[PDB]
């Protein structure tokens, strides 16, 4: 009855995030390691199940410990029921769930059965139900000596494999319900990449502080599973440009353009979006290339434009945008207009690579209020964690623009992202850079649900690496989980 | 004739304080662990008993002495007799009761039986009737015979369980006036909590020495059990001002107050307080605002004042204080006045930042008769430990006084434990500082009894602490519990 | 397989939440008395469910009235199955559920089984998933006005024992983040709390009439939830505290302050709070001392102040705000300053008692904008009863200001409801003041879910209550319940 | 544990949506039939529930295909697990579901079992669990094989009977907000049924093509479940009326009208409505009476007007229209006017009958924005299928207007629905209109859920109806079925 291959029951495999480290650093009362049980365990059940419909029935976890004869502490390990907060519990309160206690100077693995508890026959797939945890906590702390400057850390591996009474219920075809579809980053390399925040190929890697200024991106803002965040689309070509209708004003060189759609529609100022998309999200000064398709006479138009973000008639919310052009009237209402952006250009009077602040969201209302409906934040919260920046050098028409542009996710990732719209079966993704040159790994990265990356370095430093080199996606995990320096 | 949980009756749960410590510092002889029989050796029992309102049957603990290969020592457990004091037991007396003496190096846990001895049917839980108790003592000091510059400080686990005649007699309701409400510390963070000893909100925590001066402030001193002592009370508005009657003394600007109750009424001398509540317990000139209202037309009326705490006439307890003030008039000594405090100032001729004396008590009583019923003095009874101080920083009006303030306690913590009124079933209580975003522990602090908080640390240090850090109760050990250094 | 105390399963006890009355103004068809099945509803069982993660039977539900022999009508109690609307169901359709009537007259306890339907093997405590519910509902008209006067008030009072084959499944530690934590409220007694909306003591309770202006304050909000609305702090030391730079203004005696933040920090205009953290909440003249700190020789000179909010130059939400101060030029631009409150004075040149109007809420952004994101109106409902007000009163310097204050929580209250977090039951819980010394209930009053009490009272009226009297939580009941008269 | 009668567990019965058709004119791989499991499927069972609360248990299904014998074809039957979505499925992953292909030529009735697929005891009546669904599709396109011009659509029957296993839970009382109240038609005629649009009775039925205009009315939209779009309003006379404040504009005619509420309050621009309720959705001038009560003296004035639905002007959304007169007094400003449609008028200059423009949509907000809110555009979906309009004939008073009408559904059938808020089981309701007198059928016409009647005929062609007949409802077909030509 939907039986499966008898190795997979006759033996162990490792679990996706199943390994851990203990450092005399730890304290008691730390959540060392935590995993909901489930098929995802094993990655072999992970992808059969893709096929089946329901699945009951516990498991058995081997737990591998390195440690030897010269070391003390304990830990322990504990299956915490379906609904019950695991945040906050005391050291001493663990125990009192059914716990088992492994010393640090074990050799033989410890096995432990984890049964499934339920309320119902079996469990769906698409239904995501609550599933009994595993917690592994430190109980008694870590004494032993340290060989040099190097501290004896010890590492537990975790490997699962399906109880007898694991069995799947109804078959059903493999790819027509991308619940259960796994998720996959794409593998293009670090310099075909194209950055999101403006049409501009990606040029390096940043890393460094970002405490003294609030990193609030409003493009490429998109979670794990496939959701849209404050302005940011698919389209690598609409990033920052505008169409609909332009007005000329008398007395001067400027114009009023009136937003339209990106398919030439009415715009609606009530939507929930902070601005139409494609609005850039920085302020400074951009030059652009203005382009009409006017009847009549004909329609060969384009002259050299220039639009502020920081302007006080900047109202992209409202529909209503400044540009300054070079010619006194040559344009008309009534025809629809594009403007293609070129680069960012700087004003006499200001300080040098002050203008373009990346940081600094402009007031897309205007005066009238405060903008509403922003992306999230994003700041790191672990010690040691910086964030990763796809950065890229911008040209400039006239002075000297602060050249440096970042992005915490390319238009690429995004798109993928919202291609394939794979559920995250954690709170962050195990993302490591590797060379397929020679096989090996430059360095580790988090990949957080909220749509940003973390590594563990301090100060500033330009990431070297091979042009070959790309991600690649190991295991969800849980935020307990630590990285090693880079 | 109750039933208990067939669960617990076979599984082993660690007791709330039931974790200790072995370490080099601790010289023979010293009672290291201490518990008296009863529903507090196992958190579900401590919590079942608060249903009933008897018990009687024995224990069985298992202790977990998991040490390190290198260390060498000797520990004794003893049951001692009901009726029979421990305040100066020796090892050798200890030897003469029942004894089962166990190394430090033992890996199997040390499995002890423990009968109730009783001359009744039961014991009453709302009583305090003495029982069998259990001592582990230190019999051999703890040497390490190991390479290298290391401390093997070993920490013992301690677990309990009920023997098959434990049972229950009468059922009660969990009222409030009972031996209930656990133990328990606010979850509020350093930022939001206020000063005792002065209305400024904290900023930071100190630690450093305290063998140079006398540690005994009157304001914000309570016990962990919900007693108040010296001048503490729970406003904290109320904390360093004064209401009552003026009187202008010819020829000068000063004038001579007589001070009110609490709310209206008149001071009594009699009472067995130092001071009326809320009188400030450092020596210095505070600076403050005079207000009257007359009730004649309404008219509110606030002038500038100035106290001088270190003068002869400031007595407090006579019921009598002196007020410095510019005006000398435009004041009816026939109307209630109230004096809300500003700031401290200091004479700029004397020393800089040394005439606020943080640490020196005024006394209340003037030249005649000398301070009566103080609050006990406050100092470290460890090698190594110091006091933790939540420093603020008042106010300054003129010069540069000495704006750096200490207090032990913060209001909010004095509040809530006069609110509620948790019995302490030890001396110290383990407080652990968290970073809820993170889950490590940042240091571990010991919460005396008598109101004061010790840490392990050598030399000044001001403590860097996360913005969302809290503190949280672990467990309750005795006074000889070593710390872990930060 | 579990075991409970024989006794619980052979005895009646009080449901914490089953106390309800019936008064001549409900109407057949109005619903009295709602309850889901749950171990809640059992004290003991209630306790022990905290012990527990899956409770797993039904239970015998009894009922007592106390009715005079006058008053007549019927009363019936009925089980709603796990998901069906209760919306509209009127009299004669409840009979068709498993019912009991009971006669108003009625000495002795009717008893109703409630056995439990589900189609899961047991039911979880931390979840929503639907239950049976007990109803209990009028079903003939009451006619009780031939006797005694005022309304005459019908009690009821509900038992429950759990069933023969109640269990539970799961044992866990009883956690403080359970989210099972019982409701309570601070035994502090009513003199040594502190008023929310200015660092002052409070002193009396007071009760009358709203209609003749808007109550809408924005200090001392708090719902009972433990979610800040409005403009609430924790801290009583910074209720109108204004921290921040300090510039002169040439040829007169006013400052221009701008606000940092109450950390010192860059202030955040971005924030959907109304006002910055701290401010006033009243149009008024407030008298205090601000003092300025120099860093490297602490001169620190404080200065006599006044802030005069409601007018065109207080716009604490844009981050200026106006100081009226005798030296106009005793002061370094280049040092952060602190306003310390001491109290309010009222114009001479204007009528006696009128410059502190408490209600009004000043013009936070001055002429630029109508505020927004204000906390929300309180109004009593019910007819019948009053708003109660924690009233107080400040000190005066000048002139002739009103004294009266009025806060609707004190700021203990705040912050025991915000460090809590207990869920909230219903959208009315049930407090009674009671006297320690001889354990007598003086009056009982509602504390509504939206952070405010209410006592059934008509006419202004003080208070006359003994120095030690705390209050204490019962239960939570709906908004049909009839409160007792109050009386003193 | 409730009994069914006998007679139900032994014979067959037709569900109510129970036959459908295959024709030439189907595609391979459409959904022919789609049904859930559950009392629906049987109509004693569909009554019985509605006393009940749950079930449990399977069914027995038969399918007649008597089909000629000169056609070929083949039918597939599959069963679709509960929580697996059927949204894209193609013939291939239907075949990898348990399957049975069959022809269309089939004599015998095919017998299929269904057995409930749950992971609960019971499901729940008032909640909408998914459950075991069948599904029946073209697998093989008919085609037919016989000499003569003719079209051999096949009729299929399905009947269904309860298994024995079948019970229910609870009882319930049969009250009005549940899964109650099949859904009905009135059995009221044509002819005093009442236009939506307009206050006109109607006097014919007309059928014709609708791809050279966009059809997208306002007025009197009604889903098939009891919920109103855009503008539609239950009173027949506040169709078209204005209510709300007059202003005379200095120099000319026109007057300025504020639009108050439905009855006196004062209109909200913030509502999700397109235009206050009662407001024409057809660009002409509308000629009626201003009506003025003065409470002066209690005098009615009543004044010829006409409005100008396409003005710039006309901007009901805003609150604010203008009305065109002959006098430009006698009307005060500060009292309640109500304005009451008597006709439609048209410049005769302009083109004939070619003014109304029944089928355009004038601009609820003027120049400025466009139209927001609209009920969604109403086509066509299967070949050969045109829309049914009820034609009425509004008067005229000027010049040769374009009196021809069409509207929807009658303001007693929108009336019903929102009445009634009968469930819809299925998205097209059959419809056959049938004489009483002589029980033969004229037509049969689907009635889409989204409000509106579809009928298979080909180009322009007045319905003719005997003055008895009336609409009566059969079963629930899907979007594929296909109509006997009339």
Request: net charge negative; aromatic share 10%; charged share 15%.
């Given at each position: 009855?939907?039986?499966?291959?008898?190795?997979?029951?006759?033996?162990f495999?490792?679990?996706?995030?199943?390994?851990?480290?203990?450092?005399?650093?730890?304290?008691?009362?730390?959540?060392?390691?935590?995993?909901?049980?489930?098929?995802?365990?094993?990655?072999?059940?992970?992808?059969?199940?893709?096929?089946?419909?329901?699945?009951?029935?516990?498991?058995?976890?081997?737990?591998?410990?390195?440690?030897?004869?010269?070391?003390?502490?304990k830990?322990?390990?504990?299956?915490?029921?379906?609904?019950?907060?695991?945040?906050?519990?005391?050291?001493?309160?663990?125990?009192?769930?059914?716990?088992?206690?492994?010393?640090?100077?074990?050799?033989?693995?410890?096995?432990?059965?984890?049964?499934?508890?339920?309320?119902?026959?079996?469990?769906?797939?698409?239904?995501?139900?609550?599933?009994?945890?595993?917690?592994?906590?430190?109980?008694?702390?870590?004494?032993?000596?340290?060989?040099?400057?190097?501290?004896?850390?010890?590492?537990?591996?975790?490997?699962?494999?399906?109880?007898?009474?694991?069995?799947?219920?109804?078959?059903?075809?493999?790819?027509?319900?991308?619940r259960?579809?796994?998720?996959?980053?794409?593998?293009?390399?670090?310099?075909?990449?194209?950055?999101?925040?403006?049409?501009?190929?990606?040029?390096?890697?940043?890393?460094?502080?970002?405490?003294?200024?609030?990193?609030?991106?409003?493009?490429?803002?998109?979670?794990?599973?496939?959701?849209?965040?404050?302005?940011?689309?698919?389209?690598?070509?609409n990033?920052?440009?505008?169409?609909?209708?332009?007005?000329?004003?008398?007395?001067?060189?400027?114009?009023?353009?009136?937003?339209?759609?990106?398919?030439?529609?009415?715009?609606?100022?009530?939507?929930?979006?902070?601005?139409?998309?494609?609005?850039?999200?920085?302020?400074?000064?951009?030059?652009?290339?203005?382009?009409?398709?006017?009847?009549?006479?004909?329609?060969?138009?384009?002259?050299?434009?220039?639009?502020?973000?920081?302007?006080?008639?900047?109202?992209?919310?409202?529909?209503?945008v400044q540009?300054?052009?070079?010619?006194?009237?040559?344009?008309?209402?009534?025809?629809?207009?594009?403007?293609?952006?070129?680069?960012?250009?700087?004003?006499?009077?200001?300080?040098?690579?002050?203008?373009?602040?990346?940081?600094?969201?402009?007031?897309?209302?205007?005066?009238?209020?405060?903008?509403?409906?922003?992306?999230?934040?994003?700041?790191?919260?672990?010690?040691?964690?910086?964030?990763?920046?796809?950065?890229?050098?911008?040209?400039?028409?006239?002075?000297?623009?602060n050249?440096?542009?970042?992005?915490?996710?390319?238009?690429?990732?995004?798109?993928?992202?919202?291609?394939?719209?794979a559920?995250?079966?954690?709170?962050?993704?195990?993302?490591?850079?590797?060379?397929?040159?020679?096989?090996?790994?430059?360095?580790?990265?988090?990949?957080?649900?909220?749509?940003?990356?973390?590594?563990?370095?301090?100060?500033?430093?330009?990431?070297?690496?091979?042009?070959?080199?790309?991600?690649?996606?190991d295991?969800?995990?849980?935020?307990?989980?630590?990285?090693?320096?880079?």
């Open positions: 009855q939907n039986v499966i291959d008898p190795w997979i029951r006759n033996n495999v490792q679990a996706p995030g199943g390994e851990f480290t203990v450092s005399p650093r730890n304290a008691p009362g730390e959540i060392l390691w935590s995993a909901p049980l489930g098929p995802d365990l094993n990655p072999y059940l992970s992808h059969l199940a893709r096929m089946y419909n329901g699945y009951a029935g516990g498991f058995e976890v081997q737990v591998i410990l390195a440690g030897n004869a010269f070391t003390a502490g830990i322990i390990f504990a299956a915490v029921p379906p609904n019950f907060p695991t945040e906050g519990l005391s050291p001493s309160q663990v125990t009192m769930f059914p716990h088992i206690i492994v010393d640090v100077r074990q050799l033989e693995p410890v096995l432990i059965p984890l049964p499934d508890v339920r309320n119902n026959f079996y469990h769906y797939n698409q239904s995501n139900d609550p599933t009994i945890k595993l917690i592994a906590m430190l109980y008694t702390p870590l004494r032993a000596n340290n060989a040099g400057d190097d501290v004896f850390t010890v590492s537990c591996r975790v490997l699962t494999r399906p109880s007898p009474d694991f069995d799947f219920i109804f078959l059903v075809p493999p790819t027509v319900e991308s259960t579809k796994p998720f996959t980053v794409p593998i293009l390399t670090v310099e075909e990449m194209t950055n999101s925040r403006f049409p501009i190929p990606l040029e390096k890697l940043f890393t460094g502080p970002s405490g003294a200024f609030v990193v609030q991106p409003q493009n490429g803002r998109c979670t794990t599973d496939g959701v849209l965040l404050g302005t940011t689309q698919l389209s690598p070509v990033i920052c440009t505008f169409r609909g209708d332009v007005t000329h004003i008398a007395g001067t060189h400027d114009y009023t353009m009136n937003l339209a759609s990106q398919n030439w529609n009415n715009y609606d100022p009530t939507e929930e979006i902070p601005a139409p998309l494609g609005t850039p999200d920085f302020v400074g000064k951009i030059q652009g290339v203005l382009t009409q398709t006017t009847r009549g006479d004909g329609s060969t138009r384009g002259h050299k434009a220039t639009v502020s973000t920081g302007s006080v008639h900047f109202t992209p919310k409202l529909g209503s540009f300054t052009t070079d010619t006194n009237n040559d344009l008309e209402t009534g025809q629809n207009t594009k403007f293609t952006p070129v680069g960012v250009v700087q004003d006499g009077n200001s300080a040098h690579q002050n203008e373009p602040q990346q940081w600094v969201l402009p007031n897309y209302s205007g005066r009238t209020g405060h903008n509403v409906h922003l992306a999230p934040a994003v700041a790191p919260t672990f010690p040691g964690e910086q964030l990763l920046f796809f950065r890229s050098t911008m040209p400039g028409c006239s002075g000297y623009p050249m440096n542009l970042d992005c915490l996710l390319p238009q690429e990732w995004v798109l993928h992202f919202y291609q394939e719209a559920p995250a079966q954690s709170d962050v993704a195990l993302l490591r850079f590797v060379n397929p040159d020679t096989g090996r790994v430059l360095f580790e990265c988090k990949l957080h649900k909220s749509g940003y990356v973390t590594v563990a370095h301090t100060g500033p430093h330009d990431l070297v690496i091979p042009p070959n080199g790309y991600f690649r996606f295991s969800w995990v849980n935020q307990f989980y630590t990285l090693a320096p880079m």
